[PDB]
């Protein structure tokens, strides 16, 4: 209806929008974004597209596409008459003779359904399914092309009851068109039907057999698009209806082997996704047996690079990537049983003079490692030094994936004595950490970190060279590589422990780290691995970290507080206040815990002048249990380091621990139970009020069956410590816990924790011996677990044992000790005077 | 951890 004048100036505007020079283009678009705010404009756009057939097809289409963008944004304020007019024009004129016009109309229909929503245009689905039978191929083709994108956008919408589920006609209506003469039609049909498989929508599950039959009929179509979509369909079926597909499986996999070799990359990629998805299934192991000899070479050949990847480098998902993942899974499934089909390719690939072939070989060697390790062992004496040598190859990609492969054989490398394989590997690998190509830097540093997790103490002779190359890496690593260098340094620190605590190493390492720390910002993204790095470094250096702990402490306090403020704003009103990643706060808390434990009372000048106790109190009831775990650990370490700052808040903390003393959160409950013990020892007799609110819970916990060893040990130790500082309150309870207490602590080292716990059990025996007299054999067993007790604790054991011997009498003690095992009897006898 | 394996 809108027509005549103004249309000349709109045609002028379109001509201007098609300007050759950018200057007019990027000065005309302002006029367009001023005109969108007048909804009548859209009538002229759809009119130019649909009806002004005297103007050229590009201009008409461009009008349509401008109208597309006007729907992509601020479609909210479109008038109902305008929307109905565009709906009507597009949906009537779907099969225009020009394919460009046809596709413009298709994307208009798509966008008008994608923005907005389907139930605001509900006649669309029936109306264009009725056009689907049309005798004009173009109208049928365009209707299907729109349908496909509607399905791709809105699968879980049509599955839901929000539109009375029109799928129930669409699915069979589609299924009829698998038969159709045109390959494009068949492609659209199966592409529509594919979207609903994983949703396992009922409308398709109830025709699964018709669907599978039409797939088998299409299997022989030498059109690539059809085979692509059929591969996607068969991939999805492996996940959902494995049961219905199983009887046919051998034919399927023969087809899919011929399809993975197919001369098109996309077809091949889907056919390989097939193998990846199948190898995950539990039935697989017996399925592929008669095809593995034909499958494995196809995957190996796929693991070569394409020439296109060669030229690009010197994608996120490739045929190579998928083939290698499939081979890794097949390795983990068949273990050693895979080797006879793959080793003969290896001993050819690995020595080839075409470097890409050699590369595919090293990659295959790495990919099978996890599953095939045991059967690979007798060849590693040849392979590992060859891989070392390949770290010298002129082509960088070889060096990179060789680093990774060696990393995946680290466990065997460290089992052999250091001079054989480990020292050569480490020398060459440190050398290539300083390689000139960033790919090699990344791969070498990652492989080296992976190695350092397993070399452990064996690294200490090399620390000088290690730290030299590492601290030098700070100057060359620009972006991504620097983060992995933090990972490597943290792994080195965790791997060697206190053997790093020497001032020359500190002088090498701390200046660049503290530089990066000071110049990194609260809102930055690099400092997460650096926090983990410094947690490792400080936990290893302990007291040697003292000159550097100021900025990290204040920064971490800031992180915890900022996280808590963001979380508050989020819990009050989410729309403007997105929640923070509490991982930052968790690593900050763990790092402060390590600082306290490693530096001791030297942390007082930082605990005093900071709100760390307020923030910690703010953490201990956070609904994420890892936060609570970290916070209780930090509570205990502050208790140990400088309790004078903590003593005023004990009345606030102790009830919270009384609430969270709960073993269904094992990891949390451990640290909480332990903090109670450290706190009781620092408080002393002042603990009398807080004993009953925790004692019943501890007694329940230690008697819990099938409970992990660490929690049980810490529970017993804390019970003993509370009994040490408050014996009257705990003493009536020994009847109920002495048996598992000794069953646990008989296994633990003679550290100060055990000393505190046994001082506690002795102090409690001095108030109530009966609760031990009930079970005294287990106390004898536990005391026998002591190798080197303190002299006064040894006197206390003597006084208990003799006092109970004189209570029971000589002949009764004889019978009571007759069935001790010999080490028990004899240690107890010699060490305490029988 | 998510160390840069090649697949």
Chain A neighbors of B2, CB-CB under 8 A: none
Shortest Cα distance, chain B CAs vs residue A407, angstroms: 10
CA distance A671 to chain B (A): 24
**Residue A2's closest CA among A45, A58, A38?**
A45
Both tokens assigned to A529:
């691995």
Considering only alpha carbons, which residue of chain A is nearest residue B5? A404
Give the C-alpha separation, A177 to A71, whole Å: 32
Distance from CA of A452 to the nearest CA of B (A): 13
Q: Is A805 exposed, middle or buried (0-12, 13-18, 19+ CB in 10 A)?
A: middle
Do A450 and B6 count as a contact with CB atoms less than 8 A apart? no
CB pairs under 8 A between A and B: 27
Q: What span, in angstroms and rounded, lies between the C-alpha atoms of A564 and A567? A: 5
Q: Give the A-side interface with B, CB within 8 Å.
A: 320-322, 324-325, 328, 363, 366-367, 400-401, 404, 442-443, 446, 449-450, 484, 487
The distance between the two most distant Cα atoms of chain A, rounded to a whole number of Å, is 124
Hey, which bits of A568-684 come out as E strands?
none
**A324, B1: Cβ pair inside 8 Å?**
no
Read off φ and ψ for residue A94, nearest 5 degrees.
-75, -25
Range of the domain at A262: 1-834
DSSP calls for A348-374: HHTT-SSHHHHHHHHHHHHHTHHHHHH
* List of chain A residues whose C-beta atoms are within 8 Å of the C-beta of residue B7: 320-322, 324-325, 328, 367
B interface test, pick of A370, A404, A409 with most B CB neighbours within 10 Å: A404
List b or e across A331-351, with b for residues whose CB sees 16 or more CB atoms inside 10 angstroms. bebbbeebbebbeebbeebbe
In terms of Cβ atoms closer than 10 Å to its own Cβ (0-12, 13-18, 19+), residue A33 is exposed
Q: Can you tell me the distance from the alpha carbon of A287 to that of A589, in angstroms, rounded to the nearest whole number?
A: 50
Closest CA to A117 of A63, A88, A158, A164: A158
Q: How many residues does chain B have?
A: 7
Q: Which residue of A has its CA nearest to B7?
A: A321
Q: Inspect the interface and report whether the beta carbons of B6 and A446 lie closer than 8 Å.
A: no
Residue A309 CB-half CA count within 13 A: 17
What sign results for the dihedral spanned by CA atoms A722, A727, A733, A739?
positive
Instruction: At A481, list the tokens.
Output: 């590589």
Scan for tokens 């002495």, then name that residue: A738
Instruction: Report the distance separating Cα A16 and Cα A29, nearest Å.
Output: 9
Alpha helices in A116-182 (DSSP H): 124-130, 137-153, 155-158, 167-176
Interface test with B, best of A305, A328, A402, A446 (most B CBs within 10 A): A446
Question: Rounded to an integer, what distance in angstroms lies between the CA atom of residue A162 and that of residue A155?
Answer: 12
Alpha helix stretches (DSSP H) within A241-354: 242-245, 249-260, 265-279, 284-287, 292-302, 307-313, 319-334, 343-349
Q: Helices (DSSP H) in A154-264: which residue ranges? A: 155-158, 167-176, 183-194, 202-205, 208-218, 224-240, 242-245, 249-260
Q: Which residues of B touch A486 (CB under 8 A)?
A: none
> Given an 8 Å threshold on Cβ–Cβ distance, is A325 in contact with B5?
no
The partner residue sitting opposite A443, judged by closest CB among B1, B4, B7, is B4
How many alpha carbons lie under 13 Å from residue A380 in its C-beta half-sphere?
A: 23
Short-list A642, A644, A619, CA closest to A632: A619
Dihedral angle computed from the Cα positions of residues A778, A779, A783 and A784, in that order, rounded to the nearest 10 degrees: -30
> Would you say A177 and A185 are in contact if contact means Cβ atoms under 8 Å apart?
yes
* Inter-chain CB proximity B4 and A325 less than 8 Å: no
Q: Tell if the CB–CB gap between A401 and B7 is shorter than 8 Å.
A: no
Q: What is the 3-state secondary structure (H, E, C) of A415-474?
A: HCCHHHHHHHHHHHHHHHHCCCCHHHHHHHHHHHHHHHHHHHHHHHHHHHHHHHHHHHHH
Task: Give chain A positions within 8 Å (CB) of B6.
Answer: 321, 324, 363, 366, 400-401, 404, 443
**Cβ(A221)–Cβ(A186) under 8 Å?**
yes
| Nearest in space to A370 (alpha carbons), one of A338, A414, A408 | A408
Contact B3 A442 (CB under 8 A): no
Q: How far apart are CA A552 and CA A555, in angstroms?
A: 5
Contacts of A366 in chain B (CB under 8 A): 6
Is residue A398 within 8 Å of residue A349, measured between CB atoms? no
- Nearest in space to A224 (alpha carbons), one of A269, A254, A193, A176: A269
- List CB contacts (< 8 A) between B4 and chain A: 404, 442-443, 446, 484
For residue B5, list chain A residues with Cβ-Cβ distance below 8 A: 404
Determine the Cα–Cα distance for residues A163 and A166; give it in Å rounded to an integer: 7
Q: Which residues of B touch A320 (CB under 8 A)?
A: 7
Calpha distance A142→A134 (Å, rounded): 11
Collect all residues from B whose CB is shorter than 8 A from any CB in A.
Answer: 1, 3-7
DSSP conformation class of A17: H
Whether A783 and A819 have beta carbons less than 8 Å apart is answered as: no
CB A833 within 8 A of CB A798: yes
Q: Which two tokens stand for residue A735?
A: 């009847």
**Experiment type:** X-ray
For B6, the closest of A324, A449, A450 (CB atoms) is A324
The residue assigned the tokens 């593995």 is A292
The CA distance from A723 to A677, in Å, is 10
Structural domains counted in chain A: 1
Angstrom distance (rounded) from CA A329 to CA A277: 10
Nearest to A116 by CA among A80, A151, A145: A80
Best mutation site among A299, A397, A405, A443 for testing chain B: the one with the most B CBs within 10 Å? A443
Q: Residue A434 and residue A445: Cα distance in Å, rounded?
A: 9
Three-class HEC string of A740-802? HHHHHHCCCCCCHHHHHHHHHHHHHHCCCCHHHHCCHHHHHHHHHCCCCCCHHHHHHHHHHHH
CA angle A669, A673, A677 (to 5 degrees): 165
Helix (H, G, I), strand (E, B) or coil at A149: helix
Query: Are the Cβ atoms of A404 and B1 closer than 8 angstroms?
Result: no
Helices A691-702 & A709-725 angle (0-180, nearest 10): 150
Separation of alpha carbons A351 and A335, rounded Å: 25
Where helices occur in A664-737 by DSSP H, the ranges are 666-683, 691-702, 709-725, 727-730
Rounded Cα gap, residues A329 and A335, in angstroms: 10
Interface contact A484-B3, CB threshold 8 A: yes
Return the axis-axis angle of helices A40-50 and A7-17, rounded to nearest 10°: 70
């Amino acid at each position: 209806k809108p027509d005549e004048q103004g249309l000349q100036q709109i045609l002028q505007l379109l001509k201007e929008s098609q300007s050759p020079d950018t200057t007019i283009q990027r000065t005309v678009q302002q006029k367009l974004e001023q005109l969108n705010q007048y909804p009548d404009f859209n009538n002229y756009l759809i009119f130019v597209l649909t009806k002004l057939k005297s103007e050229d097809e590009p201009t008409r289409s461009l009008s349509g596409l401008i109208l597309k963008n006007n729907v992509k944004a601020h479609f909210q304020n479109f008038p109902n008459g305008v929307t109905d007019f565009i709906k009507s024009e597009c949906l009537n004129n779907i099969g225009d003779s020009s394919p460009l016009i046809r596709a413009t109309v298709g994307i208009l229909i798509t966008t008008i359904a994608s923005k907005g929503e389907l139930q605001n245009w509900p006649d669309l689905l029936p109306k264009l399914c009725s056009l689907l039978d049309s005798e004009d191929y173009n109208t049928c083709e365009g209707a299907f092309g729109a349908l496909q994108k509607i399905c791709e956008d809105s699968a879980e919408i049509l599955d839901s009851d929000v539109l009375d589920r029109p799928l129930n006609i669409m699915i069979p209506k589609f299924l009829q068109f698998f038969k159709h003469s045109s390959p494009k039609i068949r492609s659209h049909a199966v592409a529509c039907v594919n979207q609903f498989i994983i949703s396992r929508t009922q409308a398709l599950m109830l025709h699964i057999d018709s669907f599978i039959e039409n797939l088998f009929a299409l299997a022989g179509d030498e059109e690539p698009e059809v085979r692509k979509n059929v591969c996607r369909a068969l991939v999805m079926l492996l996940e959902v209806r494995m049961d219905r597909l199983l009887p046919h499986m051998h034919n399927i996999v023969e087809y899919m082997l011929q399809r993975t070799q197919d001369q098109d990359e996309n077809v091949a990629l889907e056919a390989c996704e097939f193998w990846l998805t199948l190898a995950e299934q539990p039935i697989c192991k017996d399925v592929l047996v008669r095809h593995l000899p034909k499958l494995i070479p196809v995957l190996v050949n796929g693991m070569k690079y394409s020439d296109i990847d060669i030229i690009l480098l010197k994608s996120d998902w490739n045929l190579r990537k998928c083939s290698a993942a499939a081979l890794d899974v097949l390795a983990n499934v068949y273990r050693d049983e895979l080797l006879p089909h793959i080793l003969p390719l290896l001993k050819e690939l690995l020595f080839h003079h075409e470097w890409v072939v050699k590369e595919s070989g090293i990659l295959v060697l790495g990919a099978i490692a996890e599953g095939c390790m045991q059967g690979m062992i007798p060849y590693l004496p040849e392979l590992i030094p060859h891989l070392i040598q390949c770290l010298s190859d002129k082509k960088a990609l070889v060096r990179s994936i060789t680093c990774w492969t060696l990393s995946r054989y680290a466990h065997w490398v460290v089992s052999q004595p250091p001079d054989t394989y480990l020292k050569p590997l480490m020398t060459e690998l440190l050398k290539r950490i300083l390689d000139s190509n960033k790919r090699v830097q990344e791969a070498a540093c990652s492989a080296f970190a992976t190695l350092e997790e397993e070399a452990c103490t064996e690294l200490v002779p090399y620390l000088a060279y290690i730290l030299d190359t590492l601290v030098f890496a700070f100057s060359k690593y620009q972006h991504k590589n620097l983060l992995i260098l933090y990972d490597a340094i943290g792994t080195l620190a965790d791997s060697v422990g206190h053997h790093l605590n020497k001032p020359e190493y500190i002088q090498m390492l701390m200046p660049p780290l503290i530089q990066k720390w000071n110049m990194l910002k609260d809102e930055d993204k690099d400092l997460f691995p650096l926090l983990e790095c410094l947690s490792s470094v400080a936990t290893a250096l302990q007291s040697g970290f003292l000159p550097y702990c100021e900025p990290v402490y204040q920064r971490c306090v800031n992180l915890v507080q900022k996280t808590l403020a963001q979380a508050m704003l989020n819990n009050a009103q989410p729309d403007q206040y997105e929640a923070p990643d509490k991982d930052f706060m968790i690593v900050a808390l763990d790092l402060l815990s390590g600082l306290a434990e490693g530096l001791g009372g030297n942390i007082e000048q930082l605990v005093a002048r900071s709100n760390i106790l307020t923030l910690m109190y703010q953490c201990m009831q956070d609904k994420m249990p890892e936060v609570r775990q970290s916070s209780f650990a930090l509570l205990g370490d502050l208790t140990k380091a400088c309790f004078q700052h903590v003593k005023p808040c004990i009345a606030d903390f102790m009830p919270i621990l009384g609430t969270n003393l709960n073993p269904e959160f094992i990891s949390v409950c451990n640290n909480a139970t332990w903090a109670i013990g450290e706190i009781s020892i620092q408080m002393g007799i002042e603990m009398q009020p807080y004993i009953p609110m925790v004692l019943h819970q501890l007694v329940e916990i230690i008697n819990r069956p099938n409970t992990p060893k660490t929690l049980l040990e810490n529970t017993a130790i804390t019970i003993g410590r509370l009994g040490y500082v408050c014996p009257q309150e705990v003493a009536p309870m020994l009847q109920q816990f002495i048996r598992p207490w000794c069953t646990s602590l008989r296994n633990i080292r003679d550290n100060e924790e055990k000393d505190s716990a046994f001082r506690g059990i002795c102090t409690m025996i001095s108030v109530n011996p009966s609760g031990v007299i009930q079970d005294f054999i287990f106390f004898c067993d536990a005391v026998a677990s002591w190798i080197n007790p303190k002299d006064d604790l040894r006197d206390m054991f003597c006084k208990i044992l003799h006092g109970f011997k004189n209570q029971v009498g000589d002949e009764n003690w004889r019978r009571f000790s007759d069935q001790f095992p010999l080490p028990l009897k004899e240690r107890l006898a010699a060490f305490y005077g029988v | 951890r998510k160390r840069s394996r090649p697949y």
